[PDB]
Amino acid sequence: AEIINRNKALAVSPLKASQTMGAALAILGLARSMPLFHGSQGCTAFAKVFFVRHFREPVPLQTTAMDQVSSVMGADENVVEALKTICERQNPSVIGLLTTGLSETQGCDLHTALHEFRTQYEEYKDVPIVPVNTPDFSGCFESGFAAAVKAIVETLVPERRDQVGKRPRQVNVLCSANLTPGDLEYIAESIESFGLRPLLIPDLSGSLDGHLDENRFNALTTGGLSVAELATAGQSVATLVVGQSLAGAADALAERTGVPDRRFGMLYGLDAVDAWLMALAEISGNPVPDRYKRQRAQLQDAMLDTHFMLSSARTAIAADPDLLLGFDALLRSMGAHTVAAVVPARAAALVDSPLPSVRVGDLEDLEHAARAGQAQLVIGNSHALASARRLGVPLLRAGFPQYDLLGGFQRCWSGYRGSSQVLFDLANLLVEHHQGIQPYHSIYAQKPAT
């Protein structure tokens, strides 16, 4: 696809979410973790509202509290004071040190401020701090997340090569931003069905899955990927990559451990799930279970029954590049055309797409592109509802944020059954909104006026 780059001065109804938030989401996929924004209190407050409204769960998130004075005079002391405060009050398993636009503009070198804390408070030497440079003016929520998985891999995984296959059934999985806690459950369970032991990096299905913990109060993430388990990354037989956005994190993991990888997009549709199960069968040596063979025949049937409504359907998608490419492929197997594709920022994976072009814009740009292309349905987040209502078309919620849909944060989109439910939902919206031939009132009719 030809990327129609950002051009206008004003972003109207922003599709994009900050890189800092995406990186915080990746940190949130680690057990007993605390994400820390190096910046003013407001960035963290907005991020907390964003995640609390989407997951409908408490979200750990702190700030270095950069004020007017520390923003000009220098804020490295605030970083040291925040690390010490979190280490003593909540005693974390891991801390994520993420930068904001304000800290990058000032010139705060992460590796200087972190070093100073390490030399002043040696009592917290064993608490790993993942440093990641994610200023708000660059990239997006998805690329930010992927940049945090790279920093996580470089900070909590040891640099070795001689241990590949030490845990013979173990298989790493590098997960992307748009993999919901329900998508992660399908990945882990499908892997487990082949006898393999999944190692999800990171694991949001343990922290933000939407469960009531045993403890009345938790200050850190109630679960997710443990740093103890993450150190056993070199010991695995293979690393599966789910989502093209993690190419940089897959290379970082491959160079540091030597564990060979197979790369995938979103596990949406007959061909993406076929290739997922084929790799698993080849890795474990065991055949594809009968359970997944039955679900393939069930997807083939849902494709037959929803072909009538989805073949030739014109859709408009406003989502992260992984979701765009993952939904386009699912729709392309059905004969449905993506007539409008809007991403929040550029992505290398977009260049290798069958779409004739993809725009880097906002929801206002989506509304105009969909209207030009005569879209019949929009696929986007809670913010896209107002654009869909102005267009007169139904919405199918997908991605962050989902503040207006209960349980939407945990929807499993992946696999045969998860892919089947997307076909039923797109078909059902399309049918419910289809207005047929309008009544014609004859000028000679014997119809009573009253």
Binding site: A9, C43, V69, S71, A82, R89
Partner: protein, 465 residues
């Protein structure tokens, strides 16, 4: 830098509020936050929370995507017409805009695009941290754009690092006094609205944000009495209403002290008398209406005010009686997170519920004064933002429900404790006499719920023999 020393001088002038009673105290609300232990919002947030309900205006956020991208379309306000405030508008600064210093040019063309595409009555431009640090003369850009495109551009210089959300409310009020208020005379009384015997008086409602349309329970009462609200700042407000605020006869401060600079400056400049009050609860709604008659010096208005109160109080007391037994004696733990929580306390008193109010060292001096007023002079403050301390306080006082801002919702929900939201994000109106009915319905909804015994009881497999 020398530009940043003059900005910190203006901030100290805003914190010096002679109209408030706690001016000679150590400003605890606007105090240096603890790194790694902070929960509040930035000045830009408070500025937007104050002016975003000016529904028809183009609200452009000047800065990177962290400011607008994570915060747009989340105002609990309801409008009766225009909704341009709901559209997220931001300069979405790139790395090259900050480095090359191209942000003023960016902002200038962003105002142009907003004016051309949406034709609003006015554009408001809110400064954020990144543009404030690199210098960006937001005022001069707005001035240039106003002249070149013919639409008023109002700069709301409130970068997040200046202070708290409360400071943003002061900066929002300052921006209205300086650029909007006094720029247009009120409309003549609408045709047909003539009512013999009724003298129409012009008033202003400062601090009423129409959360869930709750002001549409007070607006009919004001209308019945013959009170033309020139402007409700900023609940269901239009740019043209705000321009006329200087011609009000009486000003009402609604559940706020951050906008106290507005009422004071309007009395100093235009001679407009003001009064503090609330529309939460029976006693408060009736006192607010009684104060209006007291300052408008009209015996006909005073007599009709008593008649409205006797009518509305008879109707609401009768409607609350079938519920009176269901909420009598229920223990309420109220937490003040600077989200105007003390205003709803008076409504809970009208129900016979003993309330235990608590605050922290980071809370405002007015929040602390109201806690000494009810709990006692030797009260204990929570100080830190640790939520386990708040959970312990619930069990200590045998609290049945926690009433606090939406931030503390999951602390109460996960701690297996009933909660009632009273923040600028709820979907239920509690203002006026009619709002009292919705409040008791929401209190009963969560209190009488069987879900609480189910989440406290253990799993059938975790039961010993």
């Amino acid at each position: 830098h020398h530009h940043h020393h003059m900005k910190a001088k203006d901030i100290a002038e805003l914190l010096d509020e002679p109209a408030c009673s706690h001016n000679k105290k150590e400003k605890s609300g606007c105090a240096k936050p603890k790194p790694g232990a902070t929960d509040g919002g930035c000045s830009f947030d408070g500025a937007q929370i104050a002016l975003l309900p000016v529904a028809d205006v183009a609200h452009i956020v000047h800065g990177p995507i962290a400011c607008a991208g994570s915060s747009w379309d989340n105002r609990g306000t309801r409008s009766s017409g225009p909704d341009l405030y709901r559209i997220g508008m931001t300069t979405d600064l790139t790395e090259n805009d900050v480095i090359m210093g191209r942000a003023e040019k960016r902002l200038f063309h962003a105002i142009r695009q907003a004016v051309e595409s949406y034709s609003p009555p006015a554009v408001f431009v809110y400064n954020t941290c990144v543009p404030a640090l690199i210098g960006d003369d937001v005022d001069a850009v707005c001035k240039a754009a106003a002249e070149r495109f013919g639409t008023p551009v109002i700069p709301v210089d409130s970068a997040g690092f200046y202070g708290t959300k409360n400071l943003g409310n002061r900066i929002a009020g300052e921006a209205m006094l300086k650029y909007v208020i006094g720029t247009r005379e009120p409309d003549p009384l609408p045709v047909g609205s003539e009512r013999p015997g009724i003298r129409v008086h012009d008033v202003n409602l400062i601090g009423e944000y129409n959360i869930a349309g709750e002001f549409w329970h007070v607006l009919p009462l004001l209308d019945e009495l013959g009170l033309r609200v020139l402007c409700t700042l900023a609940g269901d407000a239009r740019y043209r209403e705000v321009q006329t605020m200087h011609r009000a006869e009486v000003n009402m401060m609604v559940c706020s002290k951050a906008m106290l600079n507005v009422a004071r400056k309007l009395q100093e400049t235009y001679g407009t008398p003001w009064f503090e009050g609330s529309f939460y609860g029976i006693t408060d709604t009736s006192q607010a209406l009684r104060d209006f008659a007291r300052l408008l010096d009209d015996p006909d208005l005073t007599a009709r005010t008593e008649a409205l109160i006797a009518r509305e109080e008879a109707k609401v007391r009768a409607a609350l009686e079938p519920w009176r037994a269901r909420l009598e004696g229920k223990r309420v733990l109220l937490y003040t997170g600077g989200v105007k929580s003390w205003s709803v306390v008076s409504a809970l008193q009208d129900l016979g519920m003993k309330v235990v109010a608590t605050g922290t060292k980071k809370s405002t001096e007015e929040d602390k004064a109201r806690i000494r007023e009810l709990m006692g002079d030797d009260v204990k403050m929570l100080d830190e933002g640790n939520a386990r301390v708040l959970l312990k306080t619930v069990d200590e006082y045998q609290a049945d429900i926690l009433i606090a801002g939406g931030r503390n919702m999951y602390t109460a929900l996960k701690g297996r404790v009933p909660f009632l939201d009273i923040n600028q994000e709820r979907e239920f109106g509690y203002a006026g006499y009619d709002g009292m009915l919705e409040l008791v319905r929401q209190l009963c909804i969560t209190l009488e719920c069987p879900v609480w015994e189910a989440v406290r009881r253990p799993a059938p497999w975790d039961i010993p023999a």
